[PDB]
């Protein structure tokens, strides 16, 4: 289609640090992909990011009970929605499926875990190889799970026993797999 | 969704403590907010105080109310009521997880009666300025303990007691009016259905 | 503030009425509330940025309208006797439940099956007693506004041409002359108290004024008596030395 | 430690809007504008929390009215298209006769309009697939996820049509 | 419990 498009985006961000101890709130308005007006709980009032949001900042900050409402958003909005989903979001724990297999270089498939905090470590015989820690990086499956392939570049010689160790906040002890 | 508060009118002497009960039966409220609205005589509705977090309490104009999610109540309190506090107080309930929609209680009417330091109860007869054959009976200058009973006859009309303040003399008085078109009606028996002080003055017209 | 109009209105069953409201708070959300004859407050509509968001099973009879964020109007086509109530207009910063509602003065609507039962008040002023003057050195005037329906009245005292408020007590509610009938006329009293010397001055003038809100010049009137329109009925009295 | 974002948008002249909550990159839920219903990313979420979708439709109503004012402010300047970056992948090691699912991950694009189909052996396959809504980004572009369960002679392509692309982009995955 | 949405404010016109 030839006719042009016009995009308006609004994002209400709640940033948490050490749980609900330190909370920062952002009320951001966007045109196409350019922010033009923003409320920040650290600043305390609406400010114009670009020249395009200057009328909104002037008009919104003058509305009755506006400043009192946005300055209380960290309590009525952010800290509230944090406790609503805390049981199945902040405390969601899904244990990882670890698979070791090469296709020489060994690959430690780590699938279906959550959250993204994780550590993978190879062991030649209990030394923890450093040379050859080729990792494909953490990737997000979009279904509240993560996976990551952790390849090792070594020549498996005779009865050498390689160990893929996995450390995740869902477990109490590291998980190990051998080949 | 319903809100229950103290029914009817509450009469309190000044400097006394007040408690206005209010409980809400949130049955399908995901995020209840509690409100106290007040309507002073001759004015419109206005917010007294409100609480948004389930544990905190709100205060204004000496009034105080604690959002108590455990007993699902929101009682209003004040240690010393003033004569200016006489108004109608409404307990309200909203759901912050939805569009704003206030469910109101039936409202509680508050009447703060002042102390009359020098009572001088009397019943006077006042004649009309145009015609002289019409008149009313005026019961005035009685203590705040005296309750004026409303008439139980459709042809006798008795008003409620009123408090006027002559601010230049700094004087306050209570007054009730009674009138009728009945022939055997007189100011001597107009307030017989009320308990008035024994030393009430009845001048001879 | 939140301004709404009209303050009072009385109409026959089946007519049309239009209420209008405006708020100057820069608010996005406005409301309409109904207060029935039992003082129970209940929401009717709620608009956000010229669009309806809340309809609390209001009959199709009611038609709210808003072409501006700060305006909200309500039209009731073919009113019923059940529509007699006080209608409050309110506004909030937005539709969030944690926002305060700011209410207007209200519109008191009276819907009647028969406009022949509308009557203005008759006003009378009763001079103070000689006994009260010699017993308390004070003088009290009683004003009676009787035989009016509906109870859309505003009483006020006027001394020497100026409206006074000190020393005035008006009944907060009227009483019904024949309380058996639900269409009964009303009566209202008020008492102005001054010092005996001020009343005994012949050069002082006292006037009780009762503002009545009745029919308009638009509605027709079949009966022989005067059309009970919005008007002022007063009773006066001058001071007397003896 | 944690970030919760309530993301909304509206697009003209296509007249399509969307509303969702993001938790650390994953969608908590979105609101289907057509059915006026709240759709949770995981069916289990709806049993632990609730959200009245009526408030989402009102926000989109305001965003539509705001868009014209902003478009009229900017002297009707359009948005410049940005081509996406697809990446197909599988979520488990591939094994014959053992089920799995492909993931066609569209990344870094705008406006949020895509025509995405699954090509098997050159013929489209519409049976058993699943789609997610547009997901927000820090640079305010968008992401998307498509899924296709299957059993591993068959070649599988992910055809992606976007206005910022001169030709429909093909990404192949065979065993 | 229930999720609460921050309402979208109307732009200056
Ligand atoms: C403020 C600005 O950018 N100026 C131009 C204006 O001269 C022109 O009339 C308009 C046409 O749409 O485009 C813009
Ligand atoms: C984090 O918050 C907890 C309370 O929830 C507190 O006890 C702790 O000291 C905080 N940690 C830091 C580093 O401030
Ligand atoms: C998707 O297909 C439709 C045809 O129904 C076409 O109008 C539209 O431009 C296409 N969009 C893209 C991004 O290719």
PDB file of C-alpha atoms in Angstrom, chain A residues 13-112:
ATOM      1  CA  UNK A  13       7.276   2.078  32.936  1.00  0.00           C
ATOM      2  CA  UNK A  14       7.751   0.855  36.518  1.00  0.00           C
ATOM      3  CA  UNK A  15      11.421   0.368  37.425  1.00  0.00           C
ATOM      4  CA  UNK A  16      12.110  -1.635  40.593  1.00  0.00           C
ATOM      5  CA  UNK A  17      15.357  -1.886  42.567  1.00  0.00           C
ATOM      6  CA  UNK A  18      15.646  -4.368  45.449  1.00  0.00           C
ATOM      7  CA  UNK A  19      11.976  -5.252  45.246  1.00  0.00           C
ATOM      8  CA  UNK A  20       9.705  -2.324  46.095  1.00  0.00           C
ATOM      9  CA  UNK A  21      12.361  -0.543  48.178  1.00  0.00           C
ATOM     10  CA  UNK A  22      13.334   1.938  45.433  1.00  0.00           C
ATOM     11  CA  UNK A  23      10.740   2.580  42.713  1.00  0.00           C
ATOM     12  CA  UNK A  24      10.925   4.959  39.743  1.00  0.00           C
ATOM     13  CA  UNK A  25       7.951   5.773  37.513  1.00  0.00           C
ATOM     14  CA  UNK A  26       7.889   7.008  33.910  1.00  0.00           C
ATOM     15  CA  UNK A  27       4.867   8.213  31.923  1.00  0.00           C
ATOM     16  CA  UNK A  28       6.169   8.455  28.355  1.00  0.00           C
ATOM     17  CA  UNK A  29       4.348   9.522  25.182  1.00  0.00           C
ATOM     18  CA  UNK A  30       5.760   8.855  21.718  1.00  0.00           C
ATOM     19  CA  UNK A  31       5.114  10.054  18.157  1.00  0.00           C
ATOM     20  CA  UNK A  32       6.253   7.480  15.546  1.00  0.00           C
ATOM     21  CA  UNK A  33       9.321   6.356  17.589  1.00  0.00           C
ATOM     22  CA  UNK A  34      10.278   9.752  19.146  1.00  0.00           C
ATOM     23  CA  UNK A  35       9.438  10.644  22.803  1.00  0.00           C
ATOM     24  CA  UNK A  36       7.933  14.150  23.092  1.00  0.00           C
ATOM     25  CA  UNK A  37       6.604  14.377  26.677  1.00  0.00           C
ATOM     26  CA  UNK A  38       7.518  12.462  29.823  1.00  0.00           C
ATOM     27  CA  UNK A  39       6.726  12.397  33.531  1.00  0.00           C
ATOM     28  CA  UNK A  40       9.552  11.227  35.798  1.00  0.00           C
ATOM     29  CA  UNK A  41       9.088  10.507  39.497  1.00  0.00           C
ATOM     30  CA  UNK A  42      12.648  11.726  40.111  1.00  0.00           C
ATOM     31  CA  UNK A  43      11.860  15.083  38.490  1.00  0.00           C
ATOM     32  CA  UNK A  44       8.298  15.263  39.816  1.00  0.00           C
ATOM     33  CA  UNK A  45       6.519  16.959  36.900  1.00  0.00           C
ATOM     34  CA  UNK A  46       5.887  16.611  33.187  1.00  0.00           C
ATOM     35  CA  UNK A  47       8.696  17.780  30.908  1.00  0.00           C
ATOM     36  CA  UNK A  48       8.900  18.188  27.133  1.00  0.00           C
ATOM     37  CA  UNK A  49      11.455  15.814  25.614  1.00  0.00           C
ATOM     38  CA  UNK A  50      11.214  17.524  22.216  1.00  0.00           C
ATOM     39  CA  UNK A  51       9.587  20.780  21.149  1.00  0.00           C
ATOM     40  CA  UNK A  52       6.545  18.724  20.108  1.00  0.00           C
ATOM     41  CA  UNK A  53       5.467  18.003  23.698  1.00  0.00           C
ATOM     42  CA  UNK A  54       5.755  21.522  25.133  1.00  0.00           C
ATOM     43  CA  UNK A  55       1.966  22.206  25.064  1.00  0.00           C
ATOM     44  CA  UNK A  56       1.140  18.922  26.811  1.00  0.00           C
ATOM     45  CA  UNK A  57       3.655  19.528  29.610  1.00  0.00           C
ATOM     46  CA  UNK A  58       2.310  23.038  30.208  1.00  0.00           C
ATOM     47  CA  UNK A  59      -1.317  21.888  30.018  1.00  0.00           C
ATOM     48  CA  UNK A  60      -1.012  18.668  32.033  1.00  0.00           C
ATOM     49  CA  UNK A  61       1.015  20.103  34.928  1.00  0.00           C
ATOM     50  CA  UNK A  62      -1.729  22.707  35.476  1.00  0.00           C
ATOM     51  CA  UNK A  63      -4.617  20.234  35.760  1.00  0.00           C
ATOM     52  CA  UNK A  64      -6.282  19.899  39.149  1.00  0.00           C
ATOM     53  CA  UNK A  65      -4.831  17.016  41.225  1.00  0.00           C
ATOM     54  CA  UNK A  66      -2.494  16.017  38.376  1.00  0.00           C
ATOM     55  CA  UNK A  67       0.830  16.511  40.170  1.00  0.00           C
ATOM     56  CA  UNK A  68      -0.558  14.835  43.293  1.00  0.00           C
ATOM     57  CA  UNK A  69      -1.701  11.832  41.235  1.00  0.00           C
ATOM     58  CA  UNK A  70       1.460  11.230  39.200  1.00  0.00           C
ATOM     59  CA  UNK A  71       3.707  11.712  42.239  1.00  0.00           C
ATOM     60  CA  UNK A  72       1.746   8.915  43.958  1.00  0.00           C
ATOM     61  CA  UNK A  73       1.986   6.545  40.975  1.00  0.00           C
ATOM     62  CA  UNK A  74       4.964   4.724  42.513  1.00  0.00           C
ATOM     63  CA  UNK A  75       2.588   3.600  45.292  1.00  0.00           C
ATOM     64  CA  UNK A  76      -0.873   3.297  43.717  1.00  0.00           C
ATOM     65  CA  UNK A  77       0.338   1.942  40.352  1.00  0.00           C
ATOM     66  CA  UNK A  78       3.875   0.503  40.371  1.00  0.00           C
ATOM     67  CA  UNK A  79       4.089  -1.029  43.853  1.00  0.00           C
ATOM     68  CA  UNK A  80       0.502  -2.274  43.491  1.00  0.00           C
ATOM     69  CA  UNK A  81       0.959  -4.122  40.189  1.00  0.00           C
ATOM     70  CA  UNK A  82       4.221  -5.561  41.538  1.00  0.00           C
ATOM     71  CA  UNK A  83       2.365  -7.421  44.291  1.00  0.00           C
ATOM     72  CA  UNK A  84      -0.471  -8.550  42.021  1.00  0.00           C
ATOM     73  CA  UNK A  85       1.779 -10.705  39.830  1.00  0.00           C
ATOM     74  CA  UNK A  86       4.570 -11.359  42.341  1.00  0.00           C
ATOM     75  CA  UNK A  87       3.546 -14.992  42.862  1.00  0.00           C
ATOM     76  CA  UNK A  88       3.837 -15.916  39.164  1.00  0.00           C
ATOM     77  CA  UNK A  89       6.307 -13.307  37.830  1.00  0.00           C
ATOM     78  CA  UNK A  90       8.985 -12.333  40.381  1.00  0.00           C
ATOM     79  CA  UNK A  91       8.790 -15.813  41.938  1.00  0.00           C
ATOM     80  CA  UNK A  92       8.352 -17.838  38.734  1.00  0.00           C
ATOM     81  CA  UNK A  93      10.858 -20.714  38.882  1.00  0.00           C
ATOM     82  CA  UNK A  94      11.113 -23.265  36.065  1.00  0.00           C
ATOM     83  CA  UNK A  95      13.961 -25.756  36.257  1.00  0.00           C
ATOM     84  CA  UNK A  96      16.180 -26.170  33.179  1.00  0.00           C
ATOM     85  CA  UNK A  97      16.531 -29.198  30.915  1.00  0.00           C
ATOM     86  CA  UNK A  98      20.253 -29.688  30.271  1.00  0.00           C
ATOM     87  CA  UNK A  99      21.424 -31.800  27.324  1.00  0.00           C
ATOM     88  CA  UNK A 100      25.049 -32.430  26.325  1.00  0.00           C
ATOM     89  CA  UNK A 101      25.882 -33.476  22.754  1.00  0.00           C
ATOM     90  CA  UNK A 102      28.457 -32.536  20.081  1.00  0.00           C
ATOM     91  CA  UNK A 103      28.073 -32.132  16.307  1.00  0.00           C
ATOM     92  CA  UNK A 104      34.937 -32.028  17.552  1.00  0.00           C
ATOM     93  CA  UNK A 105      33.103 -29.505  19.742  1.00  0.00           C
ATOM     94  CA  UNK A 106      30.652 -30.268  22.555  1.00  0.00           C
ATOM     95  CA  UNK A 107      27.325 -28.435  22.910  1.00  0.00           C
ATOM     96  CA  UNK A 108      25.489 -27.984  26.217  1.00  0.00           C
ATOM     97  CA  UNK A 109      21.868 -27.322  25.317  1.00  0.00           C
ATOM     98  CA  UNK A 110      20.068 -25.610  28.210  1.00  0.00           C
ATOM     99  CA  UNK A 111      16.374 -25.306  27.383  1.00  0.00           C
ATOM    100  CA  UNK A 112      13.151 -24.158  28.978  1.00  0.00           C
TER     101      UNK A 112
END
